[model samples]
Target: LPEHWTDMNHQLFCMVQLEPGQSEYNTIKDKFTRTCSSYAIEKIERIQNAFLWQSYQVKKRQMDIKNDHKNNERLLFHGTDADSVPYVNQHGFNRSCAGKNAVSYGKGTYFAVDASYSAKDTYSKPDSNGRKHMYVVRVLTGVFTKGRAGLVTPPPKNPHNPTDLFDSVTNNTRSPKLFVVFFDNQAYPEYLITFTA
Candidate 1:
């Protein structure tokens, strides 16, 4: 009934007919099939398991090539830059927010946006006269936004935890969750900005 099927004029193929095959056997064996189901699985599983087949086939072939390498050769090597800061992994987090959006992975200096301004609405902060404040952040090769403020959230209030900057809460304030994400070697920013005044 889907649009694609309309023109295919497809035919259903089977070992046993749909009704009698699915229906109970003479007594109550009920769909018994070492042989019959094998026929169906042989037909359907290939199509349904297409992704599995492709994944295993490609992965094995690639690994086999690596396996041919030296006895101690590594298929993978993990390393981080000496100057890189530590942070949590960004995958699996739901970063969605209501409103217009854009995401970019940029390499540049860090920025610190001051947080004294009030939240104007969902996506931005504007002055009392409705003029949006402009804070410039440079992004490109060799230039980055640094010392960006308001992005970090304060740490949790617990005495057992270090009562200073070392508190875990400092991590939350490390950046504006609104437009900031990161990886080992990149910055991911999701922003909704209006360039025209």
Candidate 2:
């Protein structure tokens, strides 16, 4: 996990034991609907996800680019998962550097911490910090995410859950074997973030 890294407490409630239309599943999932943030999402994961983790590396930032939007370039800030110069140690890679594997829940996140365009001077340069960069943290979804729980599925290959982003955006990153994860349970439906300004 990176500095902002956290656990999702990824609990699941299958309706198999209940009637077709019921509250057990609905009730637990409904927790997302409740909020104290002026601008927030109903996914509920962000809330619990945040507290579950000791602290947030950065505040949640958002961008709403339309379907027709073009010329958009996204920047990612992942941990030691890549050999991208910045994170590599003296030997090239360090397993001890970033805590542990990051859990994006399979969903891909995109970000540009330079929203203020303040980093314009270093536009050609990359930041080694994951928090300083914008990202699309996606909810872990699918059946028997053994592919995920096993650290088989990775972030940013980062799935495209409908609610993660606007649905028009793609991860735009290359897929690596380390990106795959293996999970023990089937990830529930798609979920995402909606924050207050």
Candidate 3:
């Protein structure tokens, strides 16, 4: 590796958490076809739900680069639309959210796979908790935010105590719901796994 990153490492590095033999492994594998040492990513980030994580990887298509290479680091940002706050464009890459060579949020019309890999040296375990750790693939494309991860908050009504069985029909004494959300361009649109409350 160079003492400093070059244009070589300019990838989005989107990781989808999935278990071996799981159906999604094939789904994600189908979504992005790699040219070298290709295979569906292995590791499943069960730290949260896998569904939300996949959404994060897909939505990254809309996220743009706000500031470029500040101190050799770029930052990703989210864009807003008329209907939804961070509404994502349906087809094609959203150039409006792209990053400049090193400045404003630039965009790219397309992407080519640069390389693929797995973190064998780091964790040699056969499985990671309920899932395995995926060998991270470098996209050779992408930046994002300040924070550990996104949040999936409870319903606003009783942000604290949803201490009852929610009755959907009556809409009374609602049960507390649980969700797994993630976000931030750098902020993934919080992978929200909500039920009720």
TM-score for every candidate vs. truth? 0.15, 0.17, 0.21
Q: How big is the positional error of residue 67 in model 2, measured in Å on the Cα after superposition?
A: 2.6
Worst 10 residues of 1 by lDDT: 39-48
- The candidate that wins on TM-score is 3
Residue 98's lDDT in candidate 2: 33
Could you tally the backbone clashes for each prediction? 23, 33, 31
TM-score of 1: 0.15
Q: In order, what lDDT does every prediction score?
A: 0.23, 0.25, 0.25
Predicted candidate 2 versus true structure: per-residue lDDT over 130-163, tens digit per residue: 2121112222211112223223233332356533
Residue 115 shift from truth in candidate 3, angstroms:
8.0
Winner on TM-score (2 vs 3)? 3
* Residue 187 local lDDT, model 3: 24
The sequence of per-residue lDDT tens digits that candidate 3 reaches over residues 21-42 is 6664444344233432333343
Best by lDDT: 3
User: In candidate 1, which residue ranges exceed 4 Å CA deviation?
Assistant: 1-132, 137-153, 156-158, 166-176, 179-197
